[PDB]
Amino acid sequence: KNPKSDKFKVKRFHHIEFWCGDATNVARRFSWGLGMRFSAKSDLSTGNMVHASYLLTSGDLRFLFTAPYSPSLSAGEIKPTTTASIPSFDHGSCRSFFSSHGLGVRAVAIEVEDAESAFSISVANGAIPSSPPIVLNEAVTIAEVKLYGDVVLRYVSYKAEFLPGFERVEDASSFPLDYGIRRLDHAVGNVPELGPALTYVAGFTGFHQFSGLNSAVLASNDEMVLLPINEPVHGTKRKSQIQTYLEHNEGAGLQHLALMSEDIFRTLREMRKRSSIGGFDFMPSPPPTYYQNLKKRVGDVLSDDQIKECEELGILVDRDDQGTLLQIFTKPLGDRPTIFIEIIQRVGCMMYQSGGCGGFGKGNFSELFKSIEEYEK
Amino acid sequence: KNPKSDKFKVKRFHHIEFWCGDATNVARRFSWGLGMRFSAKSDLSTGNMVHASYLLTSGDLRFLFTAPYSPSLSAGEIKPTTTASIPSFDHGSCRSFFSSHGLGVRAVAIEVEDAESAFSISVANGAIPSSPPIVLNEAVTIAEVKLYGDVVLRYVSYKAEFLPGFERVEDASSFPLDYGIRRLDHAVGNVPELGPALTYVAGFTGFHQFSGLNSAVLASNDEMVLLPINEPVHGTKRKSQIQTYLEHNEGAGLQHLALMSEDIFRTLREMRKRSSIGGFDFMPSPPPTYYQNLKKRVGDVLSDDQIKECEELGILVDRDDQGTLLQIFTKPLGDRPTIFIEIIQRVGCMMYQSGGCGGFGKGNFSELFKSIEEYEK
Numbered sequence: 001k002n003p004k005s006d007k008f009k010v011k012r013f014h015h016i017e018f019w020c021g022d023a024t025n026v027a028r029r030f031s032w033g034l035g036m037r038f039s040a041k042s043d044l045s046t047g048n049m050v051h052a053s054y055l056l057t058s059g060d061l062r063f064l065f066t067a068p069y070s071p072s073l074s075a076g077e078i079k080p081t082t083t084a085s086i087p088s089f090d091h092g093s094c095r096s097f098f099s100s101h102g103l104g105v106r107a108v109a110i111e112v113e114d115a116e117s118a119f120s121i122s123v124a125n126g127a128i129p130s131s132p133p134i135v136l137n138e139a140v141t142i143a144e145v146k147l148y149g150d151v152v153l154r155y156v157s158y159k160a161e162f163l164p165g166f167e168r169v170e171d172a173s174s175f176p177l178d179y180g181i182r183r184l185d186h187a188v189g190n191v192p193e194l195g196p197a198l199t200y201v202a203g204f205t206g207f208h209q210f211s212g213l214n215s216a217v218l219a220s221n222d223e224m225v226l227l228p229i230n231e232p233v234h235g236t237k238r239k240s241q242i243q244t245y246l247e248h249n250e251g252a253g254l255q256h257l258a259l260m261s262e263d264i265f266r267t268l269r270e271m272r273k274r275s276s277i278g279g280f281d282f283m284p285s286p287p288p289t290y291y292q293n294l295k296k297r298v299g300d301v302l303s304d305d306q307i308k309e310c311e312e313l314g315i316l317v318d319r320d321d322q323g324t325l326l327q328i329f330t331k332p333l334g335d336r337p338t339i340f341i342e343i344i345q346r347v348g349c350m351m352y353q354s355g356g357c358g359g360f361g362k363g364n365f366s367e368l369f370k371s372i373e374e375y376e377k
Numbered sequence: 378k379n380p381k382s383d384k385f386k387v388k389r390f391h392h393i394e395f396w397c398g399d400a401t402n403v404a405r406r407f408s409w410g411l412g413m414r415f416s417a418k419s420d421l422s423t424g425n426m427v428h429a430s431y432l433l434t435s436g437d438l439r440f441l442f443t444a445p446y447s448p449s450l451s452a453g454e455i456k457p458t459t460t461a462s463i464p465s466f467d468h469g470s471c472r473s474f475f476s477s478h479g480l481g482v483r484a485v486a487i488e489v490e491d492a493e494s495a496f497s498i499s500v501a502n503g504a505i506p507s508s509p510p511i512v513l514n515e516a517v518t519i520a521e522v523k524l525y526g527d528v529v530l531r532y533v534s535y536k537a538e539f540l541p542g543f544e545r546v547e548d549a550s551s552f553p554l555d556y557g558i559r560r561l562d563h564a565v566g567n568v569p570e571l572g573p574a575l576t577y578v579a580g581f582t583g584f585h586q587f588s589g590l591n592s593a594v595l596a597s598n599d600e601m602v603l604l605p606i607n608e609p610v611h612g613t614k615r616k617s618q619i620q621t622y623l624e625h626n627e628g629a630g631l632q633h634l635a636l637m638s639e640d641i642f643r644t645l646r647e648m649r650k651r652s653s654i655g656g657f658d659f660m661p662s663p664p665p666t667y668y669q670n671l672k673k674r675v676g677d678v679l680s681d682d683q684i685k686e687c688e689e690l691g692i693l694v695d696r697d698d699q700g701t702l703l704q705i706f707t708k709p710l711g712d713r714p715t716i717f718i719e720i721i722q723r724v725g726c727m728m729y730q731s732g733g734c735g736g737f738g739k740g741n742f743s744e745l746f747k748s749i750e751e752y753e754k
């Protein structure tokens with residue numbers, strides 16, 4: 001049941017912005033670990049005296065890494081005369097965010113038809129404003145509202161390059177890495193209380209509802225923008241990983257980003273080759289019993305060769321009534337046990353592919369526990 | 378003339394500590410870009426609730442990357458009950474350092490015979506104390522005094538692993554990268570006023586004296602610990618790069634680290650292969666006229682094949698009366714035009730090799746200007 005109740009026209013995920021202490025080092029690490037190219041910059045060399053911002057791309061996936069310069073470089077500026085390319089940026093906010101949360105996602109950005117209208121309608125419907133609409137070079141409009149914690153939902157709309165003031169990166173500095181990642185599939189928040197969080201966000205967007213935790217997913221009209229939200233469940237034997245997140249993150253924030261691959265086997269081969277030479281580490285693989293049990297569940301979708309390929313790469317498999325999901329999770333991206341990445345590929349629900357085909361892997365809670373007990377043997 | 382006036386027994390450079398916002402991402406980037414292995418850690422997985430610290434090694438070179446966790450994780454602790462492995466660490470100091478300077482060197486650490494005695498004698502001779510001697514596990518003593526800006530000189534002494542509380546890194550996470558770097562040759566500070574800086578440091582150590590700037594080098598008795606210091610020269614047509622450093626760094630700090638390679642050609646081949654895939658970029662190469670003029674200066678030390686190999690890698694060559702120096706400089710390591718790295722190899726002054734063989738490249742100021750004018754042609 002999709003009531004198509006979006007209060008404004010949403011298109012697709014546009015970009016994710018990380019707030020960093022040093023954007024250069026984080027962007028270089030992510031580029032090598034994920035196979036994303038350097039594609040745009042806004043920094044001192046482009047006349048930005050306020051913040052350093054570096055854009056990585058893989059397919060339609062856009063990761064932005066931003067860090068503040070010394071406020072002394074821009075002490076003479078006022079907002080009307082700013083050299084910042086992202087007018088919502090604030091030195092104090094950025095330093096406070098990073099000191100409080102460490103490395104993490106500041107903005108989940110979605111492309112909309114009219115960012116000024118989306119902002120107005122959102123705020124009229126309960127959204128807490130964060131940055132009012134600003135028109136950039138008469139070409140792009142950006143606005144921001146609070147999503148959860150210190151994470152903002154950023155609206156971007158184009159009348160017709162990434163943003164005005166960003167320069168394309170010289171091909172010499174731009175090496176064409178590509179491990180197969182193509183777009184953001186969903187972005188997941190952790191909050192202390194799921195009920196109020198859902199009511200707030202669904203309140204101002206009109207998005208509809210699509211062990212250790214309770215969870216729910218908000219979706220846009222075509223269900224291509226997907227925003228799951230988790231809350232902890234207290235009292236269990238093993239401490240809730242959602243609660244661990246909230247403690248180490250100092251409150252609510254973005255938990256994980258799910259990146260769709262057009263060939264998850266190639267992506268995971270390439271990422272695992274680089275885990276120990278600057279890239280990303282992966283969660284421990286499920287036991288061999290999990291992969292023996294895959295024949296009964298998905299033996300009609302994957303060959304036995306494709307199933308053993310899942311086993312050597314540590315990939316998880318789940319299935320609902322509509323499609324099948326291949327997924328795997330990285331270890332945390334930074335010092336704190338907070339944000340991590342999921343790599344996914346979906347098979348089925350062809351019409352293009354419909355959003356959320358195969359679900360989000362909820363069936364792997366019981367399947368992993370069963371395989372861990374069965375492999376104890 | 379070496380008067381051998383060290384006021385305490387100094388051995389060698391021991392390690393360099395960077396203060397970071399996220400130690401994981403910086404350490405992974407540096408490991409891949411420089412070919413250093415992950416060798417020790419102190420973090421949540423080792424029981425450290427205060428800071429995340431990761432040690433990289435190449436030969437005798439030790440780079441330490443440290444970042445603070447949320448102070449809430451350790452709110453119940455006091456110094457007597459701390460889980461920090463580096464007792465001098467302070468959340469407030471680290472956050473203030475990184476907000477003020479961005480990514481940079483906090484500590485230049487030297488091994489001494491007795492850190493408690495070196496601290497006492499230093500402070501008795503004008504050193505500004507930073508952290509008093511602390512004995513770790515009855516095995517290692519650490520103490521710190523101010524060097525310049527917010528950089529400290531750290532004394533380390535061993536009675537007989539890196540530091541107590543650090544754990545060796547599991548070989549799976551430890552990939553044996555090595556591009557040929559073997560030790561720290563010298564570490565260079567930028568200050569507003571050279572005279573007072575020299576008087577202060579030479580005052581408390583007893584170290585002896587060994588365009589756009591004035592400079593001088595302080596050295597230990599065997600001249601294996603080398604600490605050059607720069608000051609700007611104002612008024613020139615081209616603005617002093619020392620002054621640019623001080624503005625973007627918000628004052629004095631460490632300008633560059635010079636890393637000795639046992640095979641600079643191999644090091645530069647390996648580093649240049651990775652410049653655009655997560656590693657480090659290099660300053661623009663000198664014109665071909667510079668390399669034509671190399672035959673007259675060093676044609677008796679390097680073959681013409683070895684000289685063309687310098688040319689394809691962009692290596693600089695200088696020579697004093699005692700030896701010859703091969704060197705090259707990276708672009709800045711992070712967002713700000715502040716800290717960078719020099720790769721060097723020295724030929725000559727065999728006895729072992731004496732410290733500072735070939736100087737520091739001062740002759741390349743005139744040689745580059747001459748080659749740039751000659752190549753204008």
Ligand SMILES: CCCC(=N)C1=C(O)C[C@@H](C[C@@H](C)SCC)CC1=O
Nearest residue numbers: 188215228229230360361362364365
């Ligand atoms: C926020 C909820 C939506 C969502 N994205 C989500 C996840 O990705 C994690 C899945 C759990 C197991 C795969 S974890 C064991 C390796 C289930 C799930 O529901």
Ligand SMILES: CCCC(=N)C1=C(O)C[C@@H](C[C@@H](C)SCC)CC1=O
Nearest residue numbers: 565592605606607737738739741742
């Ligand atoms: C602090 C001074 C000691 C020192 N380390 C030092 C440097 O490394 C830079 C050298 C200058 C040219 C190579 S720069 C043009 C590429 C000269 C020099 O004196």
Ligand SMILES: [Co+2]
Nearest residue numbers: 188258342360
């Ligand atoms: Co997910």
Ligand SMILES: [Co+2]
Nearest residue numbers: 565635719737
């Ligand atoms: Co040097």
